[PDB]
Symmetry: D2
Subunit: 262 residues, 4 copies
C-alpha cells in the first residue's frame, strides 16, 4: 500500500537530527530502516520505537563511519538482519566553524573523511549487491554549502562540493542500470547544531534575544526566512527513492528556500 | 492523493509532456484544466482519459502568445473550477537550425512562447495566489536551459531565461506560501522528439528508427533511455505538494545524467 | 599590442561598461566602432578618449532592436575599417519592478535589447568570421544571468538567455577559430548604477547617497566595493587575446563574490 | 617593468606539465617563481633554467605536498630566498582511473590529500603574510572535473569539486581585502599522459587539446590588476567541455 514497501534502507548518522528525520520519512513511506550511530545510547530503544511507529522493521547499529571495517560490518549486519541493502543514505555530517587561517588540520581531516570518504566506502561496499539485484538508490546528503560558499566553513563546503562530484561520478558509472545516485542539498535546518549557533549569536550580537537572533540568522542566507524541516529533507529523499525518479541521475535536490537562487 | 481539491492549469497539455503532467496531477486529486492552441475533435477522448481519475477536468483553447487569451483562460478556470492555485507553464515549440540561418520569425516565436507566455500567466495568477496565501508555479524548462546544444540557440536561450525568471519569481514570493520552481527534462519520449528522430533516421541512418533512436539518445543521455512523461508529471506533483513549502527557485532535473557531464 | 590590427564593434559603448570595454580594447591595439541609439553632441569627445590609444575609431548611431539598423552598423564597420573581428554585445537596459506589476512593453524591450540584439549581431557577423577563420563574440551578461534578484525578472531572464545563446554559439563553432564567451559583471560603477542608487537613496534613505550605496553593495557584493569598467574591459581583452583560443562557451564572472554565495 | 614585476610566486607540483607551463608564463610576466616537486631529479637544474630564461629569480624545492611540515618548509624556503609569498598556485595533483567498486582506498586517500588538502595547508600557511602585506593571489588549479562528473574518476572529481568549494570559501573570507582566490578549470591538456581524435571528440567539442601555456595565461590574468574584483569564480579553459 506504500511506495517503498519491502525496501531495505540504511541511513548513516541517523540517530539525531537530519538523519533521524530521513529515517522516519523513509519508514513512513514503507521501508525497513537501519539506524546508525557511533556508540550505543540508553535512548536507542526510544528512537527505534519512534521510527518503528510506522510499522516497518527497524534496526540499530553502532559503527564509526571513519573505519571502513565498521562500514562493512554495518552493511553485513543489514544484509543478515533484513536482506540486501537497497537504499543507502550517506548522511553522516559534522560541522566546524573557523576562518581558514585558524582552522585546525585534524578538524579538517575529520570533516573530509566523514562527509566524503565514508560515503565512498559505503557506496563501494553496497554497489555490487545493487548491480546484482538490478536496483539501487544512493542518496548523498550534501548541503547548499556543496553548491555555494560561506565564510568560515572551508572544510564543510569542500566536503559537500566533493560529495556532489562523487554523486555525479557514481550516477554516470551506473547510468545504464537500475541504480541512481543523487544528492540532497538542504539549507538551514533547526537542530541542536543550529540551536547552539543561534544561542551563540544571541550571546555575541543580540544579547540573549532568541526571536531576533533566529530571524537575523535566517535573513542572512535563506530568503524564505524560515527553517527547513527534517521532514522536508526526508520527503525529498523519499521522492528520490520513488519509482518516479528512475531517470533522476547525478543531480541535486535543493531544499533551501532560495539560498542558492542568489 | 496530496492534491485533493487543488485547482491546476497546464498550458499546452493536449499532447506530450503537458498531457502526462495533467494526468499525474489528476491522479493526485487536483482538478486540472488542459489547454491547446485550438479546439479539436479529440478533446472529448483526451479529456475523458484525464478524467478517468475522478477529478473535474476541463479543456480550453487559447494562444499563449496572446495575453488576452491567457486572461480569458484564467477567468475561465476561476469561474468554472475556482481560484488558480497550481500553475504549470509547459512550452512546446522547437526549431533546430544553426545560428547563421535561424529564421527571425521562429526565434521570436520560440522566445515568446517559451518565455513571455509564462511571464504573462505568472503575472496574472500571482495576485490570487498571494490573496489565498498558497501557490505552486512550475515552469517546464529543459536541460537546454542549463547547457547548450548545437542548432538550438533559440530554445536554449528561452529555457535559460525561463529558469532565470523562475529564480526571480521564487525570490519575489519567498516569504509567502507561494513557491516557484522549474523542471528540466532530457530527451523524453513524445511525438515531437519522434519527429526529430525520424528526421535523423532519414538523414543519417537510411530511415532506420531504432538505430537513429540509439544514436539520438547516446549523444546526450548517459542512461541511453528516454525520460517518460509520467516521470515529468511525478516531478511536477512532487513540487506542487504542500510538503515542498521550502523548495523555491530550484531546478528538478530529470535527464538520465545528461547535465552531470 | 595584444590585439593590434583587430577590428572591434562594441554595442552600447557611448557610456559605462561599453565605453570602458572600447577603451580597453583600443588600449590593446584594436580598432573600435562605438554604437549608440541616437547621435549625441558628446560623440566626438567619447571618440577622442578612445582614440587616445592610437587605433582607428569610428562611431555609429543605430538601435539594435531594428535588425536593419544592425546590418547597417555591420556594413558601416566593414566599409570604414574592415571585417568585424571582435563583436562585443553589450547594449543593455534595466527596469526594476515586481513581476505582478511589470509593464509588458518594458519586458518586451528588455528581452529584445538584452537578448535578441545579440542574436541579430552574431548572425550577421558569423559568416565573415567563418570565412576568415578567426573571430571573437563576447557577450556582456550579468550576475543576473547566473542567479536571480527581486524585481529584475525581465533582466534576469534576458541575461540567462544570453548565457544559453553564448553556449550554443560556442558549441556551433568549437572546431573553428571563433570563440563565444560571456562576461558576468556584478555592480559596476557607471552612470546607470548611480541613477539606480540615487533612486533608492531618495525613496528609502532620505537622499543619503552614502547610506544607499552601502546598502546597495552589501546586499549583493561581498567585496563591499564596485567593479570598474576598466576591469570589464580587461576581461574582454583577455577573452579576445590569443591565449583564450580554447576558452569556449564559458563565463568570466567579475562580481566581487556575488555568485560565490 | 612587467605586469607582475616584483611579485614572488610559488607554483606547487610544477616540475612538469601544467605547473611548469603556469610557472613559465608567470615568469614571462615578470614574477619570481619557486617550483616544487615531490623529489629531486637532475631535470631540476634544467627546469630551473628554463623558467629562468625570462629574467626572473627562480628556485626549486623538493617537498611532498601531502606532508604539512614539508609544505611549511617550502614556504619558509621561499621567504628565505626570494621573500614573502605573494602568489600561491595550488597545482599538485594526480589521477587514477578506476570504477568506484574497485577503486583502491589508498589511491582515493592520496588523490584527496594531494588535490584538496595540500591546497588547504598552503593557503593556511600563506594567508597571514598576504593579509599583513595587504595583497595576495591564490590560484587553485582545478579541473573540468571540478564542475562535472566523469566515469571512473570518482576520487578526482570529488577532490576538484572540493577544491572549488574551498576556493569559494577563501574568496568570501578575503573579499574586503587585496587578496583574491580563484580556480582555473582546464580540460584535456597536452601532456605525457587516430586514437587521439576519438579521445578528444567525446569530451571537448573543439576536438583539440588545451596547452599548458593557456593555463599559465589564465593564471596571469587572475594575478593581474584587472582581476582585483574577480573573486571565488572559475576560469574554465576546456574547449566547450562544460557548455554541454
Amino acid at each position: 500500500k506504500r511506495v517503498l514497501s519491502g525496501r531495505v534502507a540504511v541511513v548513516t548518522g541517523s540517530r539525531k537530527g537530519i538523519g533521524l528525520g530521513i529515517a522516519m520519512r523513509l519508514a513512513m513511506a514503507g521501508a525497513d530502516v537501519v539506524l546508525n550511530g557511533r556508540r550505543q545510547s540508553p535512548e536507542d530503544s526510544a528512537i527505534v520505537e519512534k521510527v518503528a511507529a510506522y510499522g516497518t522493521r527497524v534496526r540499530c547499529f553502532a559503527a564509526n563511519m571513519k573505519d571502513r571495517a565498521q562500514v562493512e560490518a554495518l552493511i553485513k549486519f543489514t544484509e543478515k538482519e533484513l536482506g540486501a541493502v537497497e537504499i543507502l543514505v550517506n548522511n553522516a555530517g559534522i560541522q566546524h566553524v573557523s576562518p581558514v587561517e585558524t582552522f585546525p588540520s585534524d578538524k579538517w581531516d575529520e570533516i573530509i573523511a566523514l562527509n566524503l570518504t565514508s560515503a565512498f566506502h559505503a557506496t563501494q561496499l553496497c554497489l555490487p549487491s545493487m548491480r546484482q539485484r538490478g536496483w539501487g538508490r544512493i542518496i548523498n546528503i550534501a548541503s547548499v554549502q556543496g553548491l555555494v560558499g560561506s565564510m568560515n566553513k572551508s572544510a564543510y563546503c569542500a566536503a559537500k562540493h566533493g560529495l556532489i562530484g562523487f554523486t555525479k561520478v557514481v550516477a554516470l558509472e551506473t547510468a545504464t542500470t537500475g541504480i541512481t545516485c543523487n544528492a540532497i542539498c538542504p539549507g538551514y535546518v533547526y537542530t541542536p547544531l543550529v540551536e547552539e549557533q543561534i544561542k551563540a549569536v544571541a550571546e555575541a550580537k543580540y544579547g540573549g534575544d532568541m526571536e531576533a537572533a533566529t530571524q537575523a540568522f535566517l535573513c542572512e542566507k535563506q530568503p524564505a526566512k524560515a527553517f527547513v524541516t527534517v521532514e522536508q529533507v526526508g520527503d525529498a529523499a523519499v521522492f528520490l527513492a520513488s519509482p518516479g525518479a528512475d531517470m533522476i541521475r547525478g543531480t541535486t535536490i535543493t531544499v533551501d528556500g532560495g539560498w542558492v537562487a542568489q
